[PDB]
Amino acid sequence: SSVDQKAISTIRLLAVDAVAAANSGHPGAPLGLAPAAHAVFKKMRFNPKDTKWINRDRFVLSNGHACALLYSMLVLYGYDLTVEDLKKFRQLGSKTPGHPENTDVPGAEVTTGPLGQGICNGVGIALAQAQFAATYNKPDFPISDSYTYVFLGDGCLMEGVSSEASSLAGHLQLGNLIAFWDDNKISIDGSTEVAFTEDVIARYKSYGWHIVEVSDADTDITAIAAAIDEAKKVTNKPTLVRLTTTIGFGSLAQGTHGVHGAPLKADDIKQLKTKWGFNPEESFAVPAEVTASYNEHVAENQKIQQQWNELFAAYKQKYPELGAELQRRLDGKLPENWDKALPVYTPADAAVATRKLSEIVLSKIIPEVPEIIGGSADLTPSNLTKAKGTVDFQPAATGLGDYSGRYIRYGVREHAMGAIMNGIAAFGANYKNYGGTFLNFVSYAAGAVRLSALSEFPITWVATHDSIGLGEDGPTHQPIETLAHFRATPNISVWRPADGNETSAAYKSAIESTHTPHILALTRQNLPQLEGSSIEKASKGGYTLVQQDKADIIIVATGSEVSLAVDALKVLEGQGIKAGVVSLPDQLTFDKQSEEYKLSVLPDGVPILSVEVMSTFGWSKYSHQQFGLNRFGASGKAPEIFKLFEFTPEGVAERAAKTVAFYKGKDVVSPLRSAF
Amino acid sequence: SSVDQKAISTIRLLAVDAVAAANSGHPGAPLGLAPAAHAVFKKMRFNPKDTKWINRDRFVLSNGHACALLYSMLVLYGYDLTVEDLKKFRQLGSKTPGHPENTDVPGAEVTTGPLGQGICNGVGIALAQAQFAATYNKPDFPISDSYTYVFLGDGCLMEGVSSEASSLAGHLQLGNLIAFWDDNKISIDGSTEVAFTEDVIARYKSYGWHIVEVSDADTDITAIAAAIDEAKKVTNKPTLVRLTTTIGFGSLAQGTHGVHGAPLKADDIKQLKTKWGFNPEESFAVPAEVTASYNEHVAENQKIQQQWNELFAAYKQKYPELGAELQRRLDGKLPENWDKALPVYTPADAAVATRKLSEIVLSKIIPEVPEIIGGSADLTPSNLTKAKGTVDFQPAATGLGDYSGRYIRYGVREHAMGAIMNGIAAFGANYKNYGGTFLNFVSYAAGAVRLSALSEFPITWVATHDSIGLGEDGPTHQPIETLAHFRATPNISVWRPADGNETSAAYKSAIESTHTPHILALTRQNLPQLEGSSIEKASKGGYTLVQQDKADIIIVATGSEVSLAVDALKVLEGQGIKAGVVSLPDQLTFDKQSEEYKLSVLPDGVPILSVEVMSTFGWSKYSHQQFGLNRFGASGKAPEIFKLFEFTPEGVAERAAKTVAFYKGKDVVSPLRSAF
Ligand SMILES: CC1=C(CCOP(=O)(O)OP(=O)(O)O)S[C@@H](O)N1Cc1cnc(C)nc1N
Ligand SMILES: CC1=C(CCOP(=O)(O)OP(=O)(O)O)S[C@@H](O)N1Cc1cnc(C)nc1N
Ligand SMILES: [Ca+2]
Numbered sequence A, B: 001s002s003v004d005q006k007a008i009s010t011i012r013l014l015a016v017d018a019v020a021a022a023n024s025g026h027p028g029a030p031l032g033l034a035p036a037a038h039a040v041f042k043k044m045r046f047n048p049k050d051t052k053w054i055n056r057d058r059f060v061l062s063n064g065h066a067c068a069l070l071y072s073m074l075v076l077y078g079y080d081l082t083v084e085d086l087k088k089f090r091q092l093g094s095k096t097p098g099h100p101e102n103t104d105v106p107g108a109e110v111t112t113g114p115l116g117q118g119i120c121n122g123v124g125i126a127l128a129q130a131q132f133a134a135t136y137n138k139p140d141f142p143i144s145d146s147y148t149y150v151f152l153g154d155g156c157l158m159e160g161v162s163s164e165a166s167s168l169a170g171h172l173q174l175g176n177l178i179a180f181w182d183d184n185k186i187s188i189d190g191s192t193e194v195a196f197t198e199d200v201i202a203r204y205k206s207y208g209w210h211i212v213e214v215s216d217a218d219t220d221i222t223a224i225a226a227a228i229d230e231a232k233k234v235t236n237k238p239t240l241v242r243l244t245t246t247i248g249f250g251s252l253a254q255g256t257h258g259v260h261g262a263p264l265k266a267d268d269i270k271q272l273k274t275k276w277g278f279n280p281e282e283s284f285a286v287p288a289e290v291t292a293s294y295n296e297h298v299a300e301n302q303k304i305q306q307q308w309n310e311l312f313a314a315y316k317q318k319y320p321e322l323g324a325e326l327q328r329r330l331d332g333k334l335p336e337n338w339d340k341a342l343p344v345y346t347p348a349d350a351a352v353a354t355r356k357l358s359e360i361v362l363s364k365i366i367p368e369v370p371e372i373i374g375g376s377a378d379l380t381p382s383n384l385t386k387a388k389g390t391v392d393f394q395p396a397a398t399g400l401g402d403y404s405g406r407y408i409r410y411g412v413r414e415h416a417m418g419a420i421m422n423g424i425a426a427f428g429a430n431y432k433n434y435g436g437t438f439l440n441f442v443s444y445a446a447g448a449v450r451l452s453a454l455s456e457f458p459i460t461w462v463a464t465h466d467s468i469g470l471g472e473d474g475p476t477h478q479p480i481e482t483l484a485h486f487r488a489t490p491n492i493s494v495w496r497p498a499d500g501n502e503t504s505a506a507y508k509s510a511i512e513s514t515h516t517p518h519i520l521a522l523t524r525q526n527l528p529q530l531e532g533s534s535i536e537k538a539s540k541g542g543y544t545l546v547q548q549d550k551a552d553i554i555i556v557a558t559g560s561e562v563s564l565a566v567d568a569l570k571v572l573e574g575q576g577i578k579a580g581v582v583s584l585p586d587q588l589t590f591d592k593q594s595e596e597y598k599l600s601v602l603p604d605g606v607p608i609l610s611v612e613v614m615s616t617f618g619w620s621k622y623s624h625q626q627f628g629l630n631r632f633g634a635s636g637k638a639p640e641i642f643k644l645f646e647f648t649p650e651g652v653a654e655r656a657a658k659t660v661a662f663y664k665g666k667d668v669v670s671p672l673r674s675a676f
């Protein structure tokens, strides 16, 4: 249609004008993908006035540098984003940052820009939708039937994380996922011939995806719409639509790397405008006939949501218990008193590894909290992440599970697991999802973990085998730097529970979270139940385990080293030194407590020694002296490794005594004090 | 042959017995892969008495958990590893750690165990061999003609890093790479049907690999040998050999996940021995006829190396300059006085971004040091990593470069780039290789970076756009935690040079390195040349830039914040406060200096404030108070972001004045002091 052509030109020119105003950003992919964006958004069901409608189709821009395109679509459709915001693209404090951020941009489902992430997030949105539909849909009640549309480029296809997620999505037969490859044969280094000559289509067929090819995606919106219709008929395979485009279509510099990532020249923008019937003297034009056309689609979508709300009301009458559960989840509330299922321990109970305590927690809470789902990256019998009696999330056609299942076999795919977890969280409906691996291999997923923090998603890593305590697998498996890395990242709760009560507190935090990802660092080896622990105290992140009013020293420790500190206190008593013990299961939670609470744990006037069998980085926030492990580990039986490195009651006591001596005659204030 | 069958049984039983003695480790893949290991090592050229022969074939065990297999081969072939070492498998301090470590195990080319790494390392060994051969071979002088053999399993094939490297290896037409997939249909979570149902062979064809399938790799060594011969005929494609095996072949528990990763039962070991003609009462048997057979292959290989040494002598006569260059490289020596090519600056010179200073360094040193090669992960015009006038490393058949080229187009593949760099270093011949990306995306490669440190490889990351100084791309691109992460990892030199002289010092360190990987954190934005910098002083890692004998405070800073500190010193002077400035371009190098040198930089008796626009973790090693950035960044013009966060001369001065006030009346000792 004439109006469709005008809409595509409007999108292209809004994106170009936004880049021009900022004198920064990426015009090439927006120019190339405007036809496809127009066609996809016309097929999508969404409400710009209710961005959280649970049955909306989701869109993800994995090639996030192309965000001037996304912002233009959101503005044209009347989301809470305006032309005035587009004029502030890439400007400090604006609603139009240089890559899309879900916390800041209405209609941005996830935070993209780091390549490869968005397609994996789309896999997770689609996984969640399938699980959600299997859980709630009934005959005559299609509560959930939405699609997940993803745009990606060559860069996303080169990043290994996307291969992981695409292999898994094909295995999982995720037929409501429809991805679109911007096949423009250009990246920053020039032609894809220099580095990216694989047969992408053949690779996607090998994963079990359906393929549709659109040879002229610069103009053929009829074929793009038809490709979507075709994809919707293939209910047991995710679909990749090859969009053969010209990067920067219409620019004098189209088809070149120079159009990827810098503003166009002013004369180039003028010729674009006149070629397309726009005024070359005008910027940020929005023809009223485009607004009218887009408004008609919004109004239709709002009537669809209106009818869905009536369907949901009827569902609550026909299926009273499921309807109440669904309502509670859409309200963002956990079941009343769910935390009464958390296991509680006493000091008379047996020693247990915190990985096994975690298994026990999951066993108790999964039956009580339906919005918990999770999995492991091929470490299920090691991480202990599956509750007995649950069914795996698999397509029923495989015989290996069902979409109503609760447990995901991620395979050896940590990075994609992390990004898929972000997508499950992004779906909404109160999903509280988790992923297991060895702590040292959470590092394989750092790209996604950082985005969990920036995106404010309440995902959880069940990160077992946390230290040299794992023993014989040796230094390639033993974390040193890992907790420092994640603790140094803003907005990550890094729990390292010492015992049963602390493990329950860690899960209480992880499941109640709405804005903060969690990493639970858990042991291979057994640890005793501590005298003085409780869920109540551990929920403060740091607490006084052993109070000593006339302390010569306080030992602050985490995880497996708390019991070590308690044993060292006894050695010290025989040397005439009185120690207190602080357990610090989560530094972030502790930091968020009141100043007075924190000072009650780490007071002035007493030296404080930290003990944790990994990097000492960060620990000066809480201690004057630090006993840690700042070298790689060793392959041997774990107790022998602890002895080698002097992580023994006597080794801790020796360092505590040296700390007391070092501060003799000195005035000591809390590590919590600072000059500014 | 009868002896070949006996050798295969010997290998299997040595591996099983090693696992049994440790009561730890992985018997399954060794049992399944013994026939293939026997066949491959019989085809390989190697000298157990000269592990560094530059024309040896290389073997890499990417499925490193299977290392009892590797250790058995090395023992049988008379490497510096014995049956007594096998009896100490997985025991503290042994030469047979639970995953292979190149620093500890003769004949282990790389450190494997973290899945996916070894195949990528093999790509790098093969890349280096092709570059090396193109550089040195002449008519009648095949100085380098060796192959790279890699074993991998399902786990390596699931990890995205291997997809990245396999796509690139296919593009690069690396015909001397021969990989073998242990197609046993089992991983830790059980059948591969639960998570890994892709058509692997079709995927590898899509990358441009050649395929050979061996349907009965439990017995058919004739077919495995024939597959190697076939692979050698295909000179323009890497080859994947599908070895269809039974995990744990021969065990009562063969073909099950239980055989993957735990010792066999004692009765199972007895029946293995009698089925294969061994004494069930005996462990660690080495039949003398197996030793004889293997010794004959060693003796033949040693005669091949003897002839290669004569070829090399003749090459030095026929090609005097190339021969001397090759000899120098094989001696591990850089060119005499190579560092005279490093650029030197004065304070009268213009401000320059450290990414551009890096380009200039590379431009000067690449022509002087032939063993430097490197590339970028699709960021060549941003990282500024290519010297003008050099040719890319590409197969000549593409027309895009040649194997004699110096510059690698890695594509958007940071993790594989990191692991490929490790393989290039592992090849030897003094290669000093580098890889560019944005600092924030070095994190995508953490799995490989950690292994650079553990493996002691002198690789270099050219990690540009280091901070909020990059501006508009925003918080998804702006490092916060990244330097803390890598500084907390043992054995990583993390240079953050402030100016031209410091950038030259950083490269001097990176290129001279033999055992320590480097990360060079470089700016987008221009920085002034500093009064007081030099290569000499910056080579100490930390140095006094501005000495103030009556200092009220010392400001320690890195990178872009050194100039900020110098400007703050001027503000402070107007407030009656005298400051000194320390520049700390590499914390690891500084830490390695003498205690007296370090105390001359960070003396007792004066408060010290650190300034660096990223995490404060680690900084308490060097300072009493820390001014850093412990939250995510922002999308805007960089100077506006610095102002927002008060990284301005006045903001630094305010915090310095507060630091002076906080220590009034207190006794202050160097942050370098400690109790133990
Ligand atoms: C290489 C790179 C880009 C080119 C994309 O090439 P692609 O074909 O995807 O984009 P097109 O040129 O528009 O067609 S964008 C810039 O982000 N980036 C840096 C970049 C690198 N690594 C990661 C993980 N995320 C990034 N963001
Ligand atoms: C999952 C896993 C393994 C199964 C391999 O399954 P694969 O098919 O490769 O082995 P096979 O069972 O012998 O046939 S090993 C153990 O390392 N590991 C943990 C592991 C996880 N992630 C990373 C990066 N490295 C690892 N090392
Ligand atoms: Ca592209």
Ligand SMILES: [Ca+2]
Pocket (backbone or CB within 6 Å): B153, B154, B155, B182, B184, B185, B186, B187
């Ligand atoms: Ca396997």
